[PDB]
Amino acid sequence: AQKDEEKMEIQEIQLKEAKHIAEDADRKYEEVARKLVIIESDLERAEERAELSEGKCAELEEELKTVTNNLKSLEAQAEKYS
Amino acid sequence: AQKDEEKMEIQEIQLKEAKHIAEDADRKYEEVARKLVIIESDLERAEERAELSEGKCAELEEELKTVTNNLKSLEAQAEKYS
Amino acid sequence: GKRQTEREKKKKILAERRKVLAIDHLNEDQLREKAKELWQSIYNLEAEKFDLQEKFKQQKYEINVLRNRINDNQ
Amino acid sequence: ISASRKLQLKTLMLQIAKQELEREAEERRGEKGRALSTRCQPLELAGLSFAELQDLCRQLHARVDKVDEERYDVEAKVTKNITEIADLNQKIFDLRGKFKRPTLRRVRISADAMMQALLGARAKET
Amino acid sequence: DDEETTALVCDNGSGLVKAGFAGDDAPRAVFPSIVGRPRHQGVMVGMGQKDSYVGDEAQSKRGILTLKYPIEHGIITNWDDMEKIWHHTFYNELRVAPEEHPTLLTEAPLNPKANREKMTQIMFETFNVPAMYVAIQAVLSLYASGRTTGIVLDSGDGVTHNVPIYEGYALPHAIMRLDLAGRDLTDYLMKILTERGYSFVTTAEREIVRDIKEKLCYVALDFENEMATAASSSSLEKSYELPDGQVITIGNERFRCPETLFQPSFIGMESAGIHETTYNSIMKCDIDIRKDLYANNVLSGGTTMYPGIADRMQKEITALAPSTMKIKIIAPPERKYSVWIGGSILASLSTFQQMWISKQEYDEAGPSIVHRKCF
Amino acid sequence: DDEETTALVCDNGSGLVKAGFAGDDAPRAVFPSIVGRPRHQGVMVGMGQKDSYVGDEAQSKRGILTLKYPIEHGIITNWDDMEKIWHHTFYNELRVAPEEHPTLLTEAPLNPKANREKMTQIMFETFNVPAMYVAIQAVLSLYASGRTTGIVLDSGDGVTHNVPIYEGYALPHAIMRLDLAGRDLTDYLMKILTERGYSFVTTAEREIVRDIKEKLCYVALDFENEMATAASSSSLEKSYELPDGQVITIGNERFRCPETLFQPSFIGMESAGIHETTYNSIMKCDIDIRKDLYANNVLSGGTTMYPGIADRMQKEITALAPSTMKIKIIAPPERKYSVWIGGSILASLSTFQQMWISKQEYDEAGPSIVHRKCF
Amino acid sequence: DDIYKAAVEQLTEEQKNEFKAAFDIFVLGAEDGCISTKELGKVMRMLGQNPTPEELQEMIDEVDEDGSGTVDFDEFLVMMVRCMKDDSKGKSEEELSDLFRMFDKNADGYIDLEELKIMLQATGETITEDDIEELMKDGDKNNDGRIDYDEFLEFMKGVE
Numbered sequence A, B: 001a002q003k004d005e006e007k008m009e010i011q012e013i014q015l016k017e018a019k020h021i022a023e024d025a026d027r028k029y030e031e032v033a034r035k036l037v038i039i040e041s042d043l044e045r046a047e048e049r050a051e052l053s054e055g056k057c058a059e060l061e062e063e064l065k066t067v068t069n070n071l072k073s074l075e076a077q078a079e080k081y082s
Numbered sequence C: 001g002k003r004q005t006e007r008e009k010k011k012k013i014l015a016e017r018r019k020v021l022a023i024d025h026l027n028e029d030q031l032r033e034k035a036k037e038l039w040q041s042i043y044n045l046e047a048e049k050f051d052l053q054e055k056f057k058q059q060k061y062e063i064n065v066l067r068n069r070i071n072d073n074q
Numbered sequence D: 001i002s003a004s005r006k007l008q009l010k011t012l013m014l015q016i017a018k019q020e021l022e023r024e025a026e027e028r029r030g031e032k033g034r035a036l037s038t039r040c041q042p043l044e045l046a047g048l049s050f051a052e053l054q055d056l057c058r059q060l061h062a063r064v065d066k067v068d069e070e071r072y073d074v075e076a077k078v079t080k081n082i083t084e085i086a087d088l089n090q091k092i093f094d095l096r097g098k099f100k101r102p103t104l105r106r107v108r109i110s111a112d113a114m115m116q117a118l119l120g121a122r123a124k125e126t
Numbered sequence E, F: 001d002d003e004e005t006t007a008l009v010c011d012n013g014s015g016l017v018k019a020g021f022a023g024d025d026a027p028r029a030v031f032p033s034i035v036g037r038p039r040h041q042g043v044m045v046g047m048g049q050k051d052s053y054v055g056d057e058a059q060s061k062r063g064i065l066t067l068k069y070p071i072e073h074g075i076i077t078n079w080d081d082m083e084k085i086w087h088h089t090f091y092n093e094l095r096v097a098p099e100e101h102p103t104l105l106t107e108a109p110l111n112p113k114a115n116r117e118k119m120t121q122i123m124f125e126t127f128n129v130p131a132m133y134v135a136i137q138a139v140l141s142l143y144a145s146g147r148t149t150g151i152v153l154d155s156g157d158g159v160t161h162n163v164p165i166y167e168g169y170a171l172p173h174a175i176m177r178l179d180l181a182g183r184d185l186t187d188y189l190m191k192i193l194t195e196r197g198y199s200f201v202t203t204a205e206r207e208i209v210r211d212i213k214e215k216l217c218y219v220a221l222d223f224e225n226e227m228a229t230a231a232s233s234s235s236l237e238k239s240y241e242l243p244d245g246q247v248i249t250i251g252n253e254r255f256r257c258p259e260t261l262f263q264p265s266f267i268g269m270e271s272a273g274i275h276e277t278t279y280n281s282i283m284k285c286d287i288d289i290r291k292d293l294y295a296n297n298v299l300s301g302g303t304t305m306y307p308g309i310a311d312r313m314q315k316e317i318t319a320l321a322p323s324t325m326k327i328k329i330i331a332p333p334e335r336k337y338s339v340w341i342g343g344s345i346l347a348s349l350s351t352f353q354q355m356w357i358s359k360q361e362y363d364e365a366g367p368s369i370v371h372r373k374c375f
Numbered sequence G: 001d002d003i004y005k006a007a008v009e010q011l012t013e014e015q016k017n018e019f020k021a022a023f024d025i026f027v028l029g030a031e032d033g034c035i036s037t038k039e040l041g042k043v044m045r046m047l048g049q050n051p052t053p054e055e056l057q058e059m060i061d062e063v064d065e066d067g068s069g070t071v072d073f074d075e076f077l078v079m080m081v082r083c084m085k086d087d088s089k090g091k092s093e094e095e096l097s098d099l100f101r102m103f104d105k106n107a108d109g110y111i112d113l114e115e116l117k118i119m120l121q122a123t124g125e126t127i128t129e130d131d132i133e134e135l136m137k138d139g140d141k142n143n144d145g146r147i148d149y150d151e152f153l154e155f156m157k158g159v160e
């Protein structure tokens, strides 16, 4: 009987500790999950913005190349015309 | 005494399961936390890249307009020579 | 050639679903019966035409709806 | 508000839709009868000699050929509509779909069954 | 439910048989696929001792049995035992006679033909089903993710295979099947545990080593750093209680057991790890669908449940792949049953309802019908 | 718009189909003319997989298709595919039924008769247009420049032809049609890329090589000096990112691919370059209109968009031509769509409104009406 | 258990207390007259088959607003009885499509707010501002004041 009472007591104490720690961990996980969702949305927006900027930069580079080549050709033509 | 011992056994079983579930929840939480760390790093990288591309685009616009003015001046020159 | 295919199909229709109405030597009773069966055929063709018209109208409306939803895709 | 009233409103809309479909079907039947009265003139060929019967049969044969050409045109247009519908449905499944997989549920909690099986049937619902 | 007829989505697997009716979320009955005859003599009379305990019953009497899996590497090596397993699955775990239900088995890629033909012959002659269909285990796992492209690495317990798919068109020339899987990891763990003193030999103790592997092992993000850390500190040593007491302490055996996946030279296999056979499977594909496959890498199967594998694999592929492409690894939480969920979805489709191998068709062409149009 | 009736200015071309209503500035829908059947097996059920993706849809699924152009060199080699392309163009890219719109196709000079007759027979029987007219692809490009004289070099993607015109009177004995065009340049570029290690073989990768050619290649002003410079410095090596990473670096392949135009001996063709067939086409003309043709040389077509061609060609012709004549090369910025803009202008004219081939005329004389007065 | 609870709602609320007694006959220890937070959490975590907390949160998100799992009596009914599944396949989709075709009177493929009022008048139901505002909020997912066909299907997803 003495042994059984000891075992009952210590088991009950340990069980209470376990349930409380489990609930606390669950709460922490909930908060961390919400933060992760927010950061994921921010990452998606950053990706789309970077894509837009890259497209614009590529277009500008192409147009600049075209215009520069035109300038070079007309430069040489002007010298010969002089 | 035997009945109390039996009840103690049932308590031990339930405590075991509670510990299992608590550790599983702890695992989930820590894994998601490390994932959030990684995702925050990636989002910061995306911000940096997008800002770089924007700066490139502004520079390209300026160069474009400069070269276009040069080309127009050369067009006038060529017309005069013609 | 698929245009040759459609010309062939139309020509076969003109030569398959059409009967030879050379019933001049038939009796007056039998000529009346043939006219009655022709009237039945005309009614059947008109009923098929009306059903086709209603199906075409419903299809056009549903195609307009699907075009609008395609505009709602993006 | 609550949801039972919304369910009642939805069921009323469904019943109104069924009534409208029935009314449109009746209207289609009435228009088919009107078309039969209009296009299909009463044709009585009683007492005519063979020659008039042959002439009228030949004329009806020509008219039937014209109607068959019209029906062929309309059926070709219907096949065109079917092709368009198939293409549009394919495009919708390609674009509006992707994540449009069905949402099935078979994991209902059989709590009431266990309660009714191990505690009699005091529950007057299930 | 009621009238009508539901399909049985069975999934033989190798290590766990998962079954259930089509249209649900999870398999109804999941139980190990082991058939164990008793090995001792037996003195009690009238105890009602059977001659073979199958399924989950032999995981409770395993102390006096000799468990033996009927499926070695995808292929089936012992047809009588497999028939016994199927009979148990139909009659006792689901309690539905097969005479009134279509079945949808699953099979690994690149398996011997005779295995598939014998499977269909059994299903049509012994159990006498109305119609059965055999599907590749990776296409289902791609169904469950709700995608339509992507390269799926289905690391089961028998065999690890890597099927790339684009826009619904499978690429048959890019399937890389490797025979390292969970069972070899269990054997290697059982072999490296002997370095501390714990010897597991009996076929029953293989189950204990499997439990140790499931509960303790994890995949290291960087192998050398972990090997150095575990050799200096003692923050990794996790203990575990055997089925009789005498707790054991696992040191750097924790991340060395599942490391075999990325370095198959540990168990003497020549081939490259699961981190490099995926990249090779991608590079065999055409040059224009490599970006989509890079972005939609899918994980499935049981063995891909190790804590920390979805990061190690991404790091490795990012090291191998060109720097511009984005590498993303889809690791759904329902990884273990992904194949069966996909099987349920496929069996629930209306468009699929005419692809079953109807019994009259089998009667006209024999078991070789499976290789024909009804694949 | 409203009442009235607008004409459809289609332009089959070879490589890009350009279409749009008459009276605008640019074609409404421009898309490659390729029809690609899938080549793999396909395992997903109900994915809605079609049997042939045409137009711009097959440039996105090109990873699992076998694209094949239906027009080889101006002529049409696969009539079913061309009919499919036309059907797509009318119904999905413009969404106007052809029963209520005249059409104005375009055709290269010196093409087989049967091609033109079959084209008109299709347009009148299958699509059932009210009236269609076929015009030579160079006269339109001369319309778009707003000139009335000049010798136009229309270097398309299928065939390069050089039609001289004076005061509106075309000179039929001075048309020099050469079959080197953009497609042969793509093949030659794909063949010389192998000298660095990059091998493109699949019909899908021909599109990637075409993109490389469009974005990087340029025509050298002087060939030998560029060959010497590229062999000493490294200021020319421009890099390009494939559809999956693994950037490539193009060295002196940049100006060697389009140099084939001026030296057709590179791809084994005997004839002289586009710089000398223009001079030969001029010299066949009468002695009194050579000055005007020298002063009004017009460039058109896609392949004449290489950066630096309007100077190389002028230098070459000035070398060939007598020293007194002035050589001027008209290179409008809207070169690619010059033929279609000219087609729109021609279809919008009131004087032209009675030149269409009305359907009753076709019913009376058959498809051979096109060679008759209604040209 | 939506229909069974709805039918038993014809009786008093005290029947709920009796339910608690039955629940206590399983897991005795309840005193508040209802299936409280302790009872609900314990049964959702112990009954042998454990619904995932993700599944519980997703099912609760139909009615639960705070995201915790604690509600009042009638809201508890609406939140909890809706969890179980009664509907099957949501009838036939083509019937819904034909009925929607007959719905849109102006033939544009959209059900506007005016069309919604017309449908309410056709049903003959009492003019109630709260129900009209609820229909306006619900049927309009994209905040344009109108209703589409897929929006109608979502509105009727699971409704007989």
Ligand SMILES: Nc1ncnc2c1ncn2[C@@H]1O[C@H](COP(=O)(O)OP(=O)(O)O)[C@@H](O)[C@H]1O
Binding pocket: E012, E013, E014, E015, E016, E017, E155, E156, E157, E158, E182, E183, E186, E210, E213, E214, E215, E301, E302, E303, E305, E306, E336
């Ligand atoms: N949670 C887990 N952690 C680590 N390994 C696991 C886990 N669950 C299962 N496994 C391993 O996966 C195997 C089960 O794989 P499974 O997907 O059932 O194979 P099959 O494809 O034959 O169904 C087991 O043998 C075990 O070794």
Ligand SMILES: Nc1ncnc2c1ncn2[C@@H]1O[C@H](COP(=O)(O)OP(=O)(O)O)[C@@H](O)[C@H]1O
Binding pocket: F012, F013, F014, F015, F016, F017, F155, F156, F157, F158, F182, F183, F186, F210, F213, F214, F215, F301, F302, F303, F305, F306, F336
């Ligand atoms: N910007 C460009 N630079 C270089 N080559 C080009 C460019 N655009 C098009 N091309 C070449 O021209 C071809 C398109 O020519 P196009 O005028 O469309 O032919 P068609 O006369 O059949 O319409 C393409 O195949 C490509 O090889």
Ligand SMILES: [Ca+2]
Binding pocket: G064, G065, G066, G067, G068, G069, G070, G071
């Ligand atoms: Ca709440």
Ligand SMILES: [Ca+2]
Binding pocket: G104, G105, G106, G107, G108, G109, G110, G111, G112, G115
């Ligand atoms: Ca409306």
Ligand SMILES: [Ca+2]
Binding pocket: G139, G140, G141, G142, G143, G144, G145, G146, G147, G148, G151
């Ligand atoms: Ca709306």
Ligand SMILES: [Mg+2]
Binding pocket: E013, E014, E137, E154, E156, E157, E301, E302, E339
């Ligand atoms: Mg498996």
Ligand SMILES: [Mg+2]
Binding pocket: F013, F014, F137, F154, F156, F157, F301, F302, F339
């Ligand atoms: Mg052209």
